Amino acid sequence: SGFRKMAFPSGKVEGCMVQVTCGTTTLNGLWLDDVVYCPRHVICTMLNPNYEDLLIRKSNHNFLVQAGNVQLRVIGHSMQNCVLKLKVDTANPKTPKYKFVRIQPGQTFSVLACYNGSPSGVYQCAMRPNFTIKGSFLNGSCGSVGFNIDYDCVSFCYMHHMELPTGVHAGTDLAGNFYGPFVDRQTAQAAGTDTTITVNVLAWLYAAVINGDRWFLNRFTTTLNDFNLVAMKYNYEPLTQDHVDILGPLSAQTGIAVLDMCASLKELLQNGMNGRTILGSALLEDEFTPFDVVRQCSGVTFQ
């Protein structure tokens, strides 16, 4: 038993991390097949760039691409939105089955923080409703990727770009399109009002239940509206009937009805946690999707 913030095993992505330098700018890139995806501000030197005039003045030989102790030779470059696909002369032998995928807020993905093309650490994140992530990134970590793994296949969904002034982060998917109203430019931009992910907090409460944490339950129940009218008050995000659908097998395995656990989340929101924790946490924790909980509380592996 037990319940941790678990990342995906990071080995498949490590073999795809490379160093990309251009001028006095160095960041991380993603080497899949014979293409090295990196952020596009690497061609910069950031207040108000026209990226189309910057890329047209570049040539192949401006991009230093370091795959460890091996320089990679670029043979063509193109900008798809806010990413650079530099296609090179070696296809990466550790390329794995993969997919580029665009996630929805609430969904969670492992992040492989990188510097100079060397993985530094791995941690789990969630796409906040306001299209930010709260991770750990220093100068030199751009081009780090975020990703889930489904059996043997690697769904890249995130590439780090920039830190907003509240210490949150913003980045694209791998087709190059920013999540949210964020632009790769040193102009005032701000995350937006964030909300809590109601469907993940209930999952997590189910994750407590499977693990002997039952202090926050009750006899009570209520209806989806009556609770969503309290979800709004405490800045949680609306619960749909389609959310309840996805919280079924959890409610199956534990025999606690979704509307009852909502009623229990009510209780908790309106009363706080009065000097206790759930799952080692004194806060309500919305970065565990329903599919996370059943991965972890039931042990699916990957190979």
Ligand X SMILES: *[C@H](O)[C@H](C[C@@H]1CCNC1=O)NC(=O)[C@H](CC(C)(C)C)NC(=O)[C@@](C)(NC(=O)OCc1ccccc1)C(C)C
Catalytic residues: 41, 142
Burial tier of 241 (Cβ tally within 10 Å: 0-12, 13-18, 19+): exposed
Total residue length of the chain: 303
**CA 284, CA 268: separation in Å to the nearest integer?**
9
Annotate each residue in 163-182 with x if it binds its own copies (CB under 8 A) or - if it does not, as one string.
x---xxx-------------
Identify the bridge partners of residue 160 per DSSP, sorted by sequence position: 171
Question: 10 is in the binding site of which of its own copies, ligand X, none (Cβ under 5 to 8 A by kind)?
Answer: its own copies
**CA 201, CA 284: separation in Å to the nearest integer?**
6
Closest CB to its own copies among residues 11, 192: 11
Q: Which pair of structure tokens corresponds to residue 134?
A: 């709260």
φ, ψ of residue 217 to 5 degrees: the values are -90, 170
Sheet holding 26-32, edge to edge: 71-72, 63-66, 17-22, 26-32, 35-39, 83-88, 74-80
> What SS3 state is found at 93?
coil
Contacting range for its own copies; rule: CB under 8 A; set: 36-44, 100-108, 116-124, 184-192: 116-124
- Closest to 90 in 3D by CA, of 23, 198, 16: 16
Closest CB to ligand X among residues 65, 202: 65
Min CB(177)–ligand X separation in Å: 14
- Give the number of other CB atoms < 10 A from CB of residue 261: 27
Question: 135 is in the binding site of which of its own copies, ligand X, none (Cβ under 5 to 8 A by kind)?
Answer: its own copies
Question: 104 is in the binding site of which of ligand X, its own copies, none (Cβ under 5 to 8 A by kind)?
Answer: none
Among 12, 58, 128, 161, binds ligand X (CB under 6 A): 161
Min CB(47)–its own copies separation in Å: 22
Among 21, 110, 141, 200, binds ligand X (CB under 6 A): 141
Question: 212 is in the binding site of which of its own copies, ligand X, none (Cβ under 5 to 8 A by kind)?
Answer: its own copies
Question: 257 is in the binding site of which of its own copies, ligand X, none (Cβ under 5 to 8 A by kind)?
Answer: none
Min CB(107)–ligand X separation in Å: 20
Identify the bridge partners of residue 32 per DSSP, sorted by sequence position: 35
Q: Any contact of residue 162 with ligand X (CB under 6 A)?
A: yes
Among 47, 70, 138, 252, binds ligand X (CB under 6 A): 138
Identify the bridge partners of residue 100 per DSSP, sorted by sequence position: 156
Q: Any contact of residue 301 with its own copies (CB under 8 A)?
A: yes
Identify the bridge partners of residue 17 per DSSP, sorted by sequence position: 30
Radius of gyration (C-alpha) of the chain in whole angstroms: 21
Question: 7 is in the binding site of which of ligand X, its own copies, none (Cβ under 5 to 8 A by kind)?
Answer: its own copies
Min CB(285)–ligand X separation in Å: 22
Residues near 218 by Cβ (< 8 Å), separated by ≥ 6?
260, 263, 264, 267
Footprint of ligand X on this chain (CB under 6 A)? Answer: 27, 41, 44, 46, 137-142, 160-165, 169, 184-186, 188-189
Footprint of its own copies on this chain (CB under 8 A)? Answer: 1-12, 14-15, 68, 112-116, 118-123, 125, 134-138, 140-141, 163, 167-169, 211-212, 277, 280-283, 295-303
